[PDB]
Amino acid sequence: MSEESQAFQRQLTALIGYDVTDVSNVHDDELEFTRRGLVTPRMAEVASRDPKLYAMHPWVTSKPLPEYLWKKIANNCIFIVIHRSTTSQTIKVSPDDTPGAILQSFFTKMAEQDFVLRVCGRDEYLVGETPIKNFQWVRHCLKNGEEIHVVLDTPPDPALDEVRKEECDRKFRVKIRGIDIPVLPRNTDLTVFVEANIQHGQQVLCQRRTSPKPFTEEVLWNVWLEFSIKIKDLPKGALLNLQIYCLLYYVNLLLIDHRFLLRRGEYVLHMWQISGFNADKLTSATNPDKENSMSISILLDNHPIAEMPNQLRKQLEAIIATDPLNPLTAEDKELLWHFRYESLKHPKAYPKLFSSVKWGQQEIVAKTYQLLARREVWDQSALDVGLTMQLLDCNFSDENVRAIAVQKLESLEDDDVLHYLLQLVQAVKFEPYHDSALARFLLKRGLRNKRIGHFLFWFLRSEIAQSRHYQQRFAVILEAYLRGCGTAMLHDFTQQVQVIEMLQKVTLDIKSLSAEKYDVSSQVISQLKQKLENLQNSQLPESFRVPYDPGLKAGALAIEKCTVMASKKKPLWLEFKCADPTALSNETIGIIFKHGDDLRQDMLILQILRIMESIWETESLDLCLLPYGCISTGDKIGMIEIVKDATTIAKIQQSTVGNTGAFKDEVLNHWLKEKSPTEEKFQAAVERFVYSCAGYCVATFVLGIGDRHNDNIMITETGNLFHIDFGHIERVPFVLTPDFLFVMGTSGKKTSPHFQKFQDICVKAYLALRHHTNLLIILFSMMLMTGMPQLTSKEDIEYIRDALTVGKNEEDAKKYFLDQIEVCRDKGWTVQFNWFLHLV
Numbered sequence: 001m002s003e004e005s006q007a008f009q010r011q012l013t014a015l016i017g018y019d020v021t022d023v024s025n026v027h028d029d030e031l032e033f034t035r036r037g038l039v040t041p042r043m044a045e046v047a048s049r050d051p052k053l054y055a056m057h058p059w060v061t062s063k064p065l066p067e068y069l070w071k072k073i074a075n076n077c078i079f080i081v082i083h084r085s086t087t088s089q090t091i092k093v094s095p096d097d098t099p100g101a102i103l104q105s106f107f108t109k110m111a112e113q114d115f116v117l118r119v120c121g122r123d124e125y126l127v128g129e130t131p132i133k134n135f136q137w138v139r140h141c142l143k144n145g146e147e148i149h150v151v152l153d154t155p156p157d158p159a160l161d162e163v164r165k166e167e168c169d170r171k172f173r174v175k176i177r178g179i180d181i182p183v184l185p186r187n188t189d190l191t192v193f194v195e196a197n198i199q200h201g202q203q204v205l206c207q208r209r210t211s212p213k214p215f216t217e218e219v220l221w222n223v224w225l226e227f228s229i230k231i232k233d234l235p236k237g238a239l240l241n242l243q244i245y246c247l248l249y250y251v252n253l254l255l256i257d258h259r260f261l262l263r264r265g266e267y268v269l270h271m272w273q274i275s276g277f278n279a280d281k282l283t284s285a286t287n288p289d290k291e292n293s294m295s296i297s298i299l300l301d302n303h304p305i306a307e308m309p310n311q312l313r314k315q316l317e318a319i320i321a322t323d324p325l326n327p328l329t330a331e332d333k334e335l336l337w338h339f340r341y342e343s344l345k346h347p348k349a350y351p352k353l354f355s356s357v358k359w360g361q362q363e364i365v366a367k368t369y370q371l372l373a374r375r376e377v378w379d380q381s382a383l384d385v386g387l388t389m390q391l392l393d394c395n396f397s398d399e400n401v402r403a404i405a406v407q408k409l410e411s412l413e414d415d416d417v418l419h420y421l422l423q424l425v426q427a428v429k430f431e432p433y434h435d436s437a438l439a440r441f442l443l444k445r446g447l448r449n450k451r452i453g454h455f456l457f458w459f460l461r462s463e464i465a466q467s468r469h470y471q472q473r474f475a476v477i478l479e480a481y482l483r484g485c486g487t488a489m490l491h492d493f494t495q496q497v498q499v500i501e502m503l504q505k506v507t508l509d510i511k512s513l514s515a516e517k518y519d520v521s522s523q524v525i526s527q528l529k530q531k532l533e534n535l536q537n538s539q540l541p542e543s544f545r546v547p548y549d550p551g552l553k554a555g556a557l558a559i560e561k562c563t564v565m566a567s568k569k570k571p572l573w574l575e576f577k578c579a580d581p582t583a584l585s586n587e588t589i590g591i592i593f594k595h596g597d598d599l600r601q602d603m604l605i606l607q608i609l610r611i612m613e614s615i616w617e618t619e620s621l622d623l624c625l626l627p628y629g630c631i632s633t634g635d636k637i638g639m640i641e642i643v644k645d646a647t648t649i650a651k652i653q654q655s656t657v658g659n660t661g662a663f664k665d666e667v668l669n670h671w672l673k674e675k676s677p678t679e680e681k682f683q684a685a686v687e688r689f690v691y692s693c694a695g696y697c698v699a700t701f702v703l704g705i706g707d708r709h710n711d712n713i714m715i716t717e718t719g720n721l722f723h724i725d726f727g728h729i730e731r732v733p734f735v736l737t738p739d740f741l742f743v744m745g746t747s748g749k750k751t752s753p754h755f756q757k758f759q760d761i762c763v764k765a766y767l768a769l770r771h772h773t774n775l776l777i778i779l780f781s782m783m784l785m786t787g788m789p790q791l792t793s794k795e796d797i798e799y800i801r802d803a804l805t806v807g808k809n810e811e812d813a814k815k816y817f818l819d820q821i822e823v824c825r826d827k828g829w830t831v832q833f834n835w836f837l838h839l840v
């Protein structure tokens, strides 16, 4: 390659955090094969995008204006404050007017046609053939009662986005030679054996075991494990799962490679160790640490192409109506399979139908592909996100089954792709092969829209930086995106990466300078300021896009306002000046850098919270959640958005009584009244407290994270309650302590108007979520599988079934949640005290 070609690859390696040209941990060429394969999908999307619209990336929805936003429009009139340098003029606009129309009514209101409306202080453009009511920034201002402020400037030049040009009927058997680990402690007396499983979509097609032997550094067997399944019956995507029991170690091997070739020859596989079921157990990558890991040595030596009776119908309809977690009896599977063509008429049956396929039989697999040829009902069906996500989880390894799921995602608009982007990225872990329709879909949508591409960058990079199991696959996908996003975005990502990596280093250096066991000294703060002083000059980039808020550009550090938080983790509290002079306020941009909690769990929770917001929006319900920004950037390290004018509920308590323990009921209401500028703003804060407390009580109860220490609950000075710090997990279903009830005017068995409103809001929000039970269940199970240490498959996932009271009518569901509110009233301060004791 050319000299600049090598320098460009080094540029990509720095952005990715991993060298895709490094081949220290591969036993085939699938990764390089995938790099070539993703060239055509990338270039096809680069060729299809409009240069002007890609440069301005308008954030737009097609959903109707919610009712709670329509009543916020007084006279079918929306006010836009248009700025031109130091001047400003207010314009009345119809909710259906387009940006081009309101631009015309602006110049006409005077008495060259190449200007653009941009949000003041943000890289957010109000352009395109779209009603102004369908811009997300307009709806954000409507919901929060902010004035729509816009500047009149020049569109960004699409030339900046330039992309650089490219340049056997025999039974299956495996020989288990032995296992090897370099060092083993002298002590104890341990036995060990090897379990060999043929797996497809977590179905165990066949299983064989070796004999148990004493556990030494080298254990040898030299046995043939002969299975009953024939070679010609091995489905594509099937895994040879090898596991050592004393479960201690595991490793997987694709029996059919990316070229439809049966795996053959000698293999020395370095295995993963179980830390003292989940997505990591499905990876075909081997342990990169080949010096100290357990290895297993095997030998492979063994090509593809190329009406119901009314009572049985009732049983089938009952099977289809059950939740995605309901286990399928063998009788149920034979029912779904034999009445194949009736099951095809029910889109919600497809997950259970394909779980009834005998994937270990080639003739049955062929019958399944014949079934999917007549796909009229599925192609015409309305897009069901939850249904589609079921077909992309760990239970389906067939490429054609997963392909028809990705086909349905193609109709998602950019607004909804952003809602599910994080989950779709995680679902790549469930793909048997590196190059898949799901991976190409993500690549496609990220290249089509700069906001999707921005979050796709940081979602992929988060896994690359800390997931040994999937960093190789995600790095090839990220490289494919970076080679098509354009020069301007490559420049932006470079500025962001250099900033976060410099701040990551400062974060780790500060935490080693202090201890959780002790308090924050002026010494530790002085160390921080000196380190930031060295970064600032020199050299910190002049500005960078905020990773969790790409519309915001942060400038220089305000070092005088930077400090180390008094928490146990000693996270950094950083504040940056805003680099956009057209901004309305001189407010700083606050960013928290924290080590070390798994912020990937925070990411998953906050994204589900935003999904619950969209669910409630479709029912004209506003619950006033506050899903702040949060992005994991490495192993137990990442960044968090600073919400202004907010404090923790524990700090409000301790402001009065101080490092106990003995919580008081009236302190929260006193705090809200003190922080309220007027009585009118105070009453609005209490109203916002009622809604947000109900929204979080319902949301945290469904997700099973309701029992929280009030140090992890925050409140804004404008009354917005919100939970924080999810990288963690007598009892309570949620937090509804006497201080919360006092704000609502209630104190121990005394129903107040605000508390009755809280009860009615909770029930309505709860019933609204139950109409999306299957969606919430699939998001919940996927979250445990891709974000948690280890997941019990059949029980941990079972909690949300009872929480969503599956199978009960709305009356029993309503009483169920009202009883949960009563448990909190009966428990009082008890559970909070036990949490405080747990943290003394």
Ligand SMILES: CC(C)n1ncnc1-c1cn2c(n1)-c1cc([S@@](=O)C3CCN(C(C)(C)C)CC3)ccc1OCC2
Residues within 6 Å of the ligand: 563, 565, 567, 569, 571, 573, 592, 594, 628, 640, 641, 642, 643, 644, 646, 647, 648, 714, 724, 725, 726
């Ligand atoms: C608690 C922290 C471990 N954590 N862990 C995970 N997630 C979080 C988190 C998330 N958020 C916050 N924390 C947050 C905290 C505070 S207060 O703690 C802060 C108030 C300001 N003071 C100064 C001005 C420096 C004296 C210090 C204490 C204020 C605003 C916040 O933004 C909302 C999102």
